[PDB]
Structure 1
């Protein structure tokens, strides 16, 4: 494999189906992704110490057997209304110990929260920032880097004062939280990926390489510019994500990889 490129498994969710007893039969897709040349995965199916209904140990064996790294995972635990109003998120913090230990057992380097809604107030946003720091701190102590993945909504303002993502970056410690920047959703939020990189150097330790459909197809994403600035950003790993397709899913995710493999501005490794 010429370059280290990750695949988010959410991209292949249609290709994971029940076979006999198995309700999450991901092994055939994992082989297909490895054959294409993907070198790592990011999971999108965590629940109560398990990945795709499997032990972290078995999931990790499955990924490693096709020669890919268990790099990262999307999961999270939002605060209740009461936690958010009180400031007291000790209950939610209990969830994180099991999650962190399972992620570690699956050999994960990163844990990423995929989604938080826009808070109604800066106060609520700040409580979220405290939670994020507490999570990130527990992760770091266990040897895992915790991050946050955007869509488009985080470029909205809270209370017409602060942009959500900006507030989040500014009010979390760099060692507790990096941003897994989705460059497509950033653009969809009228944000410049490169300007974000320059405003917050080192905070973007992974990218979600996403486009409307196949990567580099739409005209909506300046991958050249993005990759040119990956060093300012602090990029360690890149993860392809494809949720809409011009072809069968495998072909779409394959063509998406090929764009990156053939692009001279994508280095063989960022880590």
Structure 2
């Protein structure tokens, strides 16, 4: 028995994602709960609602099956006009709605799942200003704002700064943490542990992800990752499975069991 979360993207084939393919998510929530997942990270926020439901109903539904309503992936990128002007004030109204909806749902974190590699350091800097501004507003609402990587953030901008490094270095720790996707970090030739040591404390959440089932490909050193979890600053871990050797239910269950069986995964990080 360990505190292990689940990215609801993992079951998007059953409940949908990012505003589409919707089903009644409640039976799946129950199965995930019964498997022994203890928290959820959502993957379908839109216009004040979660999977089409009010924050109150979503919170109730998640609470009904005994899981923590922990985190949520959602975001709003800057238009080319906002990037060129450096003025992203119109975007902030969307965040007032988003932050109030997350607070009503009980959420502890909000994580932006994706930003494009910008063309220039100046653009990156504007993104940093935006991330700081979002994270500050989140912080005032009692929420921790984070960023989730794929592999593209390990590229360089203007052949100077690695994008993820720039973001980390040019955001305030209390405004932005990194929800590090260890699979995608490895895919971008990055050492998760080396990142942990370069930016201690900034990795408040991990996406525990692999090619398919967690711990099956040989491509991720979860032992080392979890051994350096204190340096990283890990508070919570979120299993993500996007591709499957089996039916989805079994893939996500085997994924949890790997962590439950792993001696290097502690019962709680919080």
Q: TM-score scaled by structure 2?
A: 0.98
Per-residue CA deviations over 1:199-254 (Å, capped at 9, x if unaligned) read 00000000000000000000000000000000000000000000000000000000
Q: TM-score scaled by structure 1?
A: 0.97
Change (3 A) 1:127 1:25: same
- Residue segments in structure 1 that go unaligned for 5+ positions in a row: none
- Residue segments in structure 2 that go unaligned for 5+ positions in a row: none
Displacement of 1:21 after TM fit? 14
Contact 2:154/2:164 (<8 A) preserved: yes
- Tell me which residue corresponds to 2:259: 260
Displacement of 1:19 after TM fit? 18
2-structure distance, mates of 1:158, 1:151: 16
Change (3 A) 1:86 1:38: same
Q: Over the residues paired in the alignment, what is the CA RMSD in angstroms?
A: 2.1
- Tell me which residue corresponds to 1:90: 89
Contact 2:146/2:178 (<8 A) preserved: yes
SS, match of residue 22 in structure 2: strand
Contact 1:3/1:267 (<8 A) preserved: yes
Displacement of 1:24 after TM fit? 3.1
2-structure distance, mates of 1:119, 1:45: 25
- Tell me which residue corresponds to 1:71: 70
Contact 2:17/2:51 (<8 A) preserved: no
Change (3 A) 1:21 1:236: closer
Displacement of 1:20 after TM fit? 18
Per-residue CA deviations over 1:50-69 (Å, capped at 9, x if unaligned) read 00000010000000000000
2-structure distance, mates of 1:20, 1:11: 15
1-structure distance, mates of 2:168, 2:20: 44
2-structure distance, mates of 1:268, 1:23: 33
Contact 2:145/2:175 (<8 A) preserved: yes
Displacement of 1:25 after TM fit? 1.0
Change (3 A) 1:19 1:270: closer
The farther-off stretch of 151-160 and 19-28 is 19-28
Aligned length: 270
Contact 2:17/2:43 (<8 A) preserved: no
Change (3 A) 1:18 1:165: closer
2-structure distance, mates of 1:197, 1:114: 20
